[PDB]
Design a protein around this ligand. Sequence first.
Ligand SMILES: [Zn+2]
Ligand SMILES: [Zn+2]
Lengths: 113, 65, 97, 54, 101
Amino acid sequence: VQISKKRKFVADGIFKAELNEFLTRELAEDGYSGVEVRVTPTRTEIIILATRTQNVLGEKGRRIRELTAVVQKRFGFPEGSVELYAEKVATRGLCAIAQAESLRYKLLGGLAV
Amino acid sequence: YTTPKKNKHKRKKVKLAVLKYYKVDENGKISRLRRECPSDECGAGVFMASHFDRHYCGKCCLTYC
Amino acid sequence: MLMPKKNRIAIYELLFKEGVMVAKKDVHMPKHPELADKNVPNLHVMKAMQSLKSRGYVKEQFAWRHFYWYLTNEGIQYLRDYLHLPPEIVPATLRRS
Amino acid sequence: HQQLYWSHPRKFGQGSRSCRVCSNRHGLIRKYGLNMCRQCFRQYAKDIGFIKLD
Amino acid sequence: IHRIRITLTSRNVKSLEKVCADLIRGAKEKNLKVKGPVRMPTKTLRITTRKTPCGEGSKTWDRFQMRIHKRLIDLHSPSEIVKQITSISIEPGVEVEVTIA
RNA sequence: CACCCGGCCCGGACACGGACAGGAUUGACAGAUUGAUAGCUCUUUCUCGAUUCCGUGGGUGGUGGUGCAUGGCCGUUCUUAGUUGGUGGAGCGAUUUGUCUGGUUAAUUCCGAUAACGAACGAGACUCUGGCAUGCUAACUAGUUACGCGACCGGUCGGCGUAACUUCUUAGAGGGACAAGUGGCGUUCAGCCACCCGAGAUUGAGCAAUAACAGGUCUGUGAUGCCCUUAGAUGUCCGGGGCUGCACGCGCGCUACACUGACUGGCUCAGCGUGUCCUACGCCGGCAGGCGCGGGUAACCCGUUGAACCCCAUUCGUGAUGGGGAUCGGGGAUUGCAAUUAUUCCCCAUGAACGAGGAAUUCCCAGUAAGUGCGGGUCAUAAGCUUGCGUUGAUUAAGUCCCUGCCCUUUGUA
Ligand SMILES: [Zn+2]
Ligand SMILES: [Zn+2]
């Protein structure tokens, strides 16, 4: 049985929010700027915008298909319905989150405020 | 506190307990001193206990008078 | 903690097969939903992963209410030696390129 | 033992429910199946889709 | 081919109006019988909570609105044509549900 | 659920040493024990198989402490018009000018003066909502008009089925209001008052600077530094009890003191918005409710949301009275494992203060005040609370700085 339009649009909201919270706590070190989720009944795509993609992919694209296995195992949608893509940020300067994360990890470097 | 102290139960250490289960004669009569547990899984693998006035199985919790 | 070997090997072989592990952070949950029929409480999965993390074989992260675990090269080595498999087999996180 | 640990029933009541984020059981928004603390909702309202108009 | 209907539901108005208009003009140029956008009452989800975490202030309240705009477009066309016209039209920030009879 | 009484559990990772298949350890029938069918512990044996158990180091928990160590939001200063660089000018200097004599504005809003000239934030703009479109695009999940058929006397029908449509209904686009037109007053400048034409000539909000409170919150958090405890625990769980305990004093409120009113019957209108729990219809019970069978994941079913004040009849008669319904006795139902210190709900009975409230003191300018119900949040059970929505709908004012505060400018200060 299917849920109401109201509950459905809310559910998508929580999905977005929780995914973001997970992605931030995981890819904070690699300057995770934002995420974009497009959903198709064939397969839903998740697009990660981060400062240094070479790193978030991992050794021969290893870490990306750890993150894929996580969201598959957790949220419970079928395997082969998600491909976590990592697109490069157009300009890292005009992203508050990226600059905030950079300032945090250079302050943790033990530099003057 | 009003109570002196509550001590945890320590298991009484018995040495080589499975030698009390069998009584082997010189020519070889392997008699089971404790009775066999008549339940399905226990059958031939578990030797049911013999208390002062009852029987008891530690696995299936089966009891007889 | 004290748990039967069946549960331990079931958690380890799942971890090795997939390469990741997820728990829901609740000690009262009856059975892990992925390990249904095997009869493995969520508690056991959490503490098993905690025990394997403390040495430094698995990397953990915590989102809202969920534990997340990634198996490392030391973990892969440890599991292959403990579970007794030939070096040919590799996790699903180390199959593709 | 096994029959006294989590023995007390929790089908209904305030103790049965909890926030999906912080696992707190006070000031909980359970409308539209949000199932989230009022403090946590105010933090996650923007990126859920809830907007402040008037 | 009988009575396929298409339920377009979104939170944004502009994107929903654009995509639905594209589906309509895409159907119209093929010479297909189309019943136009049936605009249903906009669903407004309201949450009103205290601003403060603690509870010491002048008892101020936030007012969180969530808008849901729903459009129905109806076609008297074959399922083969309906599949491809529904396939081509994709947009992030609209949900499309197609039903036959 | 922190608090009080009493009792299980480790969910003490990892490391080092000891222990150790000649068994480290796990669980438990019976009887005693206990509030407990808790192997918790005692007697008595069984049962699991390096997962543990004992020592030290080291962790991990906390609704434990400190908001005067903190982060984040949040309130307030402060709902007023305030606020700051650059370069130039004036002072040894803190500093000042710009940021202003005077008009004008809700406004440091404008005009115009001008040792300043160029700017920036706040204000405004902006976004959402109300008010107008017989123009536009549309509609068996919204209706009208017409026609056909039917029921009952050309008429009534929310009785049913087709055709023109979008006035009514939903809601996208685009129009519309700008002190625009006219007459006065205004250094004929910024602008002000009146009036015509108009749906409207001030709709209601949201957002809101600089600089600070030793403002509140560690009891929202896997936000967090120190410290306190950490296995007879401040961890965690299970049984109770408490949070409500009443010679008294305060603060939000609800029902009243009646006749412009109670009571009984009849008549006739909403809007916001919620339903995997919302409920139509049929049967049984006075009622709370009990059964049976349907619709709805919702402009589709509840629902044409037959709401209350109000309107029209009846009885009452200034009597602490058929005002008021507190407090108390019996019963009868619904939640829930559990209702006693009575969870709510219904019926019969009981019938207190209260006759408009002393000093004092709050809130408010038009669809407002107030009366009056309905929906949302809490919600197993559930509104005297708050947060919204309609409905009936006023008196008085278009002013002032007297009280209480606010902004700018002069001065005075130990
Ligand atoms: Zn047996
Ligand atoms: Zn929360």
